[PDB]
């Protein structure tokens, strides 16, 4: 994969000490387990064991909630252990090798069914690069070529034009021509109590110029879908819960709900899947600028080179570059086609209160079974382990929340987040920040964002009292002014969070 130094400098603005440090850390990895101050002096097991003594009280009335909690308890553990590059090469290979599995075309009727859900919608037009940049996150890394904060390089980036030229990504940026490459990034996810259990997620950190061009379509798309409520997970967890409720209200009395799961969905998002995304987008879009975007920009996330070490670049087509501006959009649109196709393949109609988001789905239709869904999806070159599908007539899991037809608050099947998963995240963090340089307010803000997830758990009040006891600052109760100025401290919808209201009530 190695390129000459004066070829590397056509992909990145050189010199760049920050980029140099970055790839050194990629090569070395980060072996330390980062433990927060939460219940300092106690192990993760002891924290979990102590809370479990009280959690277990729900097993009699909500035994499937206990099963859900027990399941996620097995994943509790470190999140910070990042393996060296030498031990992640298979993770990279997967993106290139997984798209060539046997893959059959999609049913044309299912594609029509998906399009029909947005009949009459205002067709999308590209936003301008300037307007798009204005609403983007500009704290994030600009990727190739400057590898700085976006905010710092806007004037050097736009106007921009990006396109594939054979295996190369050409990026014209305000008078410069660069060669584009994603940068290999990393995220850790808990997968068990040992340091070797940490899930090694690959992140494709895209060039700012590519993300701008992509978001000229995906930004207005997501906004339109949000306002129409077509993808509830893009709106809120309360919108998700409302649709879960309707799914239970309108499902076949004899039918199960199926909660699906994909192995390495991004990696398997092959050219057959890509062409379906392109067809749906072409339906949604209007204008000549859109025609050009579909031919020039849309394919980049499936073909952009990958810079995985200093001076090392990999080329060729691959699955979804996890990190594209359309990562979630392309996948969610195509996932909805998959759901329609499963129903249509069994001579019926998808219950439209079924839902999907990226690789996560929950659905029902007359006579549905998990193995039928698995067969209907997998024939397109997608990987699924039947053992990880979940089936029930009375409950479901979606976006790591449990719902039950008999567990309703003001008539909604609200989503219950695992307190066990919450405890693991309170105790373990993905990245180290020195609190001498960064402060304890940010620790507390992280705690609150985790705890807020359990706002519908039957034991949330006991859980909060348990968490308060683990925090020196008592979740901000011990930080003068903090709770009263929490939106502000957050900047330096949180004021409306349940956990904030619950803490203030304990004053």
Numbering used by the authors: 1 to 492, 520 to 534
Could you share sentences copied from the article?
Picobirnaviruses (PBV) are small, non-enveloped dsRNA viruses infecting a wide range of mammalian and avian species. Human PBV (hPBV) has been identified on almost every continent, and has been associated with acute gastroenteritis primarily in children and people that are immunocompromised. It has a bi-segmented genome with the genome segment two (PBV2) encoding the viral RdRP and the genome segment one (PBV1) encoding the CP and a protein of unknown function. The hPBV RdRP possesses a canonical polymerase fold with a 24 amino acids (aa) long C-terminal insertion loop structure that partially occupies the active site of the polymerase. The polymerase domain, which is structurally highly conserved amongst RNA viruses, has a right-hand configuration with three subdomains: the fingers (aa 85–230, 268–324), palm (aa 231–267, 325–414), and thumb (aa 415–470).
To determine the exact biological function of the insertion loop structure, a hPBV RdRP lacking the loop structure (i.e. ΔLOOP) was synthesized and expressed. Gel filtration chromatography showed that ΔLOOP was eluted at a similar position as the WT protein. The ΔLOOP RdRP was crystallized and its structure solved by molecular replacement using the WT RdRP structure as the phasing model. The overall structure of ΔLOOP appears to be essentially the same as the WT RdRP (root-mean-square deviation in distance = 0.4 Å for 3275 common atoms), except for the deleted insertion loop which became unstructured in the ΔLOOP RdRP. Given this structural information, we are confident that the removal of the insertion loop should not affect the overall folding of the polymerase, and that the ΔLOOP RdRP should provide an excellent tool to study the function of the insertion loop structure using in vitro assays. However, while the WT RdRP utilizes a de novo initiation mechanism for RNA synthesis, the ΔLOOP could only initiate RNA replication through back-priming, suggesting that the insertion loop serves as a platform for initiation. Due to the heat denaturation, the dsRNA products generated by the WT RdRP were converted to ssRNA, while the dsRNA products of the ΔLOOP RdRP retained the same mobility as the original dsRNA. This result indicates that back-priming was taking place during dsRNA synthesis by the ΔLOOP RdRP, thus producing a product that was covalently linked to the ssRNA template. Additionally, it was noted that the removal of the insertion loop significantly increased the TNTase activity of the RdRP. Given our TNTase activity data and the fact that the insertion loop is located near the C-terminus of the hPBV RdRP, we propose that the removal of the insertion loop structure leaves the dsRNA exit channel of the protein permanently open, thus allowing the 3’-end of the RNA molecules to reach the active site for nucleotidyl addition in an orientation that is compatible for nucleotide addition.
